[PDB]
Amino acid sequence: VEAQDELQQLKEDINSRQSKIQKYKDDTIYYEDKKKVYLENIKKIEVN
Amino acid sequence: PILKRTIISKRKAPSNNEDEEIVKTPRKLVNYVPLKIFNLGDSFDDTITTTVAK
């Protein structure tokens, strides 16, 4: 029963962690989009 | 007398020179547009006077 409880809690935690990884990947994609917008602003400042 | 009141401007005569729009109009996040090629000055041309100095 202890092993079953540990396995279930670990499985839930790792599923949450994988979902945390996918949301972190989405957040990094959003950060990369913000960085691309900042680079576009930097290029406009550089041309000015 | 009449001259002082005519020269002076009543604060009530205008609407305190109210601006357009309730809040300030929005602007672009960078919008630098440096320009400023000429700052005042201008008037008499520099090339002609430079030739005159030569």
UniProtKB/Swiss-Prot annotation, chain A:
Where are the membrane-spanning stretches?
A: none
Question: Where does this protein reside within or beyond the cell?
Answer: Nucleus; Chromosome
Which branch of life, at top level?
Eukaryota
Question: What else does UniProt say about it?
Answer: Present with 339 molecules/cell in log phase SD medium.
The domain comment in this protein's record states: The flexible hinge domain, which separates the large intramolecular coiled coil regions, allows the heterotypic interaction with the corresponding domain of SMC5, forming a V-shaped heterodimer.
* Family statement drawn from the similarity comment of this UniProt entry: Belongs to the SMC family. SMC6 subfamily.
Subunit info here reads: Component of the Smc5-Smc6 complex which consists of KRE29, MMS21, NSE1, NSE3, NSE4, NSE5, SMC5 and SMC6.
What job does this protein perform? Acts in a DNA repair pathway for removal of UV-induced DNA damage that is distinct from classical nucleotide excision repair and in repair of ionizing radiation damage. Functions in homologous recombination repair of DNA double strand breaks and in recovery of stalled replication forks. Probably plays a role in structure.
* Protein name in the entry: Structural maintenance of chromosomes protein 6
Could you tell me which species this protein originates from?
A: Saccharomyces cerevisiae (strain ATCC 204508 / S288c)
This chain is encoded by the gene named SMC6
Full-sequence range covered: 817 to 864 of 1114
Swiss-Prot record, chain B:
- Domain of life of the source: Eukaryota
Residues recorded with modification Phosphoserine: S15
From the Swiss-Prot or TrEMBL record, state where the protein is found.
Nucleus; Cytoplasm
Q: What does this protein do?
A: Acts in a DNA repair pathway for removal of UV-induced DNA damage that is distinct from classical nucleotide excision repair and in repair of ionizing radiation damage. Functions in homologous recombination repair of DNA double strand breaks and in recovery of stalled replication forks.
Assembly with partners or alone: Component of the Smc5-Smc6 complex which consists of KRE29, MMS21, NSE1, NSE3, NSE4, NSE5, SMC5 and SMC6. Interacts with NSE5.
Name it: DNA repair protein KRE29
Q: Which gene encodes it?
A: KRE29
